[PDB]
Design a protein around this ligand. Structure first.
Ligand SMILES: CC(=O)N[C@H]1[C@H](O[C@H]2[C@@H](O)[C@@H](CO)O[C@@H](O[C@H]3[C@H](O)[C@@H](O)[C@H](O)O[C@@H]3CO)[C@@H]2O)O[C@H](CO)[C@@H](O[C@@H]2O[C@@H](C)[C@@H](O)[C@@H](O)[C@@H]2O)[C@@H]1O[C@@H]1O[C@H](CO)[C@H](O)[C@H](O)[C@H]1O[C@@H]1O[C@@H](C)[C@@H](O)[C@@H](O)[C@@H]1O
Ligand SMILES: CC(=O)N[C@H]1[C@H](O[C@H]2[C@@H](O)[C@@H](CO)O[C@@H](O[C@H]3[C@H](O)[C@@H](O)[C@H](O)O[C@@H]3CO)[C@@H]2O)O[C@H](CO)[C@@H](O[C@@H]2O[C@@H](C)[C@@H](O)[C@@H](O)[C@@H]2O)[C@@H]1O[C@@H]1O[C@H](CO)[C@H](O)[C@H](O)[C@H]1O[C@@H]1O[C@@H](C)[C@@H](O)[C@@H](O)[C@@H]1O
Lengths: 309, 311
């Protein structure tokens, strides 16, 4: 027989969000027809193929690196993206955007660090990247940071953005941003995003997506810090390493409590790489902190899940 | 020896992997003498058979982070943080570990951002902040460390606060590269109190051998810092061993560093069961590698195996 499939033995708290570099916290399910579940990070098939902008480093997510140039008489800088390894980014390559690029619309605040090469002198500054901005054009090779300085950064020198969290306008309706289910225009206004990972949805009666949820840090304002990924990053890493051929439509998983030794709920991990659970309504799952997922068997699509309590 | 699930290391190129002492990618392989200093890092410490040691822990993002609640220090811009553990549960100073898991394992000043949310109304705040790990006030084993910041009135008490490491600084009017000092442990419990439950110091104990270091360059946010940061095991190997837990058949895993294009072996090295790597070489050398090469476990050798000299 073929290579056995498995998922990591890791508690939810032991794993990482695949869409922002922070730990998972809780499992969340709810209905999803009023939005588009089409995230591009944390997207991998159960047999290890990365889709969208998904990539293996759990820290290089929503980071940017390249050289900056100042925009005259503003406190903003244009960055020319270079690849993860400081190599040139190629925009003709059949991906939506540099791997790791943010896949939601909001203003991400972090720090831009720079090292001057001739002498090893370094500088760092609060900087914010706004992914809705018309200047957010990562697939063209360039994005824009609004910072708190007009003089410090130098041209031609390696600069790095390190994400911290998200902001929203105080006056504007609380929680009105970021919008975790709207993809940016990776090439800017009036262009189609390309090579995207598919949108996903439940396709069985009584079934809803299962989200692995973190809370992004807020830096300023009343932002909506909710962040759902469809696979923990370690799952991506796992499937990529393991490459077990999917035997059937869906991989049945049991979420077990090690303390009582019983199954708490079951769920389907679809081969294209997302999880559905049997439940109607918005629900914050209650799990033991030391519960874990374990693969059970390959079943076909029409397998009926026991309702999740 | 015995009939046992085979040992393995992940098929990842160096650049696909992450530094186990600070949340940034790996960059290059580096070797050099280590007799003139103590190699005792407490992050990126794991046995080949899956025992996490020191303050080593699984999340790559939770390294050099701190979280807890803060109180202001009057007439300064500093705050004291009472540390929670990763799950936001209280930190148990009696747990047999050197410090909260993931605490920094070197003396230096880490610059980052402190973010906070007021539970009650969803209001947020974030400020530049630095933690100086050499400072008298750096006492993570007794559940408290001190941040210097740029605000006086803004952080609230009894609210969830998080520190996100960005990089490192130094004082430019002093000897360039004098800090951070990657191979000096903080005093986890502060002054006049010994460190406890440390992962052992490491050293090559074999004629002609040197440590192999997985090396990253920490972001610098000010001045002329020493941004080299070397870990003994990539975080992904820690992760891997912990999950796998393959029984070790000897004290030495022979690895070959392979180029999958050509098929041919670039060099060979020893991955010791206590969890660090050595290589046959004398002197400082930044290893030249093909971008797509990776390490491969080939067999368990006894303690008198001689490595082919790495070029
Ligand atoms: C510091 C702060 O909270 N600033 C808010 C400001 O709060 C004001 C109100 O609470 C009023 C209500 O009476 O009090 C003002 O001062 C009080 C003071 O608290 C008392 O101690 C004193 O006895 O009485 C005085 C009388 O006022 C407070 O300053 O509200 C404005 C609007 O919410 C808010 O700005 C809005 O949201 C921000 C993020 C920004 O989008 C603005 O465009 C909006 O107008 C202030 O927030 C700060 O806004 C500043 C504008 O530059 C800065 O941007 C700063 O980043 C913001 O502070 C960050 O986030 C804020 C929303 C707030 O939640 C902070 O916790 C956080 O630091
Ligand atoms: C802005 C800056 O770089 N400040 C440095 C300062 O540089 C000055 C000197 O190099 C003198 C000597 O040439 O030139 C000054 O301006 C020159 C300019 O270079 C020429 O182009 C022109 O011909 O003449 C002008 C007129 O002077 C430079 O501004 O050097 C000191 C030390 O090198 C440095 O501060 C030292 O170390 C820092 C960490 C701090 O501890 C100080 O205590 C030390 O003196 C300045 O760095 C800034 O220091 C500020 C002091 O409050 C802040 O620390 C600020 O963060 C620092 O800026 C950061 O680091 C500086 C080294 C440099 O790396 C910056 O790019 C970075 O933002």
């Amino acid at each position: 027989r073929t290579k056995p499939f498995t998922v990591p033995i890791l508690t939810v708290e032991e794993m990482t969000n695949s869409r922002f570099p922070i730990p998972l916290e809780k499992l969340f399910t709810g209905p999803s027809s009023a939005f588009v579940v089409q995230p591009q990070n944390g997207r991998c098939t159960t047999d290890g193929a990365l889709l969208g902008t998904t990539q293996l480093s759990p820290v290089d997510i929503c980071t940017f690196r390249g050289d900056v140039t100042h925009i005259a008489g503003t406190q903003n800088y244009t960055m020319n993206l270079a690849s993860q390894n400081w190599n040139n980014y190629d925009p003709t390559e059949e991906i939506p955007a540099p791997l790791g690029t943010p896949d939601f619309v909001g203003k991400i605040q972090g720090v831009l660090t720079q090292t001057t090469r001739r002498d090893g002198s370094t500088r760092g500054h609060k900087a914010t990247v706004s992914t809705g901005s018309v200047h957010f054009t990562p697939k063209l090779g360039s994005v824009q940071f609004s910072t708190d300085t007009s003089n410090d950064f130098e041209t031609g020198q390696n600069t790095r953005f390190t994400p911290v969290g998200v902001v929203q306008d105080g006056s504007t309706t609380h929680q009105n941003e970021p919008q975790q289910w709207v993809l940016p225009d990776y090439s800017g206004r009036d262009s189609h995003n390309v090579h995207l990972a598919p949108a996903v949805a439940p396709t069985f009666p009584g079934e809803q997506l299962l989200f692995f949820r973190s809370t992004m840090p807020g830096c300023s304002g009343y932002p909506n810090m909710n962040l759902d990924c469809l696979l923990p990053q370690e799952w991506v890493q796992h499937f990529y390493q393991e490459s077990a051929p999917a035997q059937s439509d869906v991989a049945l998983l049991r979420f077990v409590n090690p303390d009582t030794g019983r199954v708490l709920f079951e769920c389907k991990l679809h081969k294209s790489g997302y999880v559905t659970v049997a439940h109607t309504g918005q629900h914050d799952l209650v799990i033991p902190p030391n519960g874990y997922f374990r693969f059970d068997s390959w079943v076909n699509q029409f397998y009926t899940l026991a309702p999740m309590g």
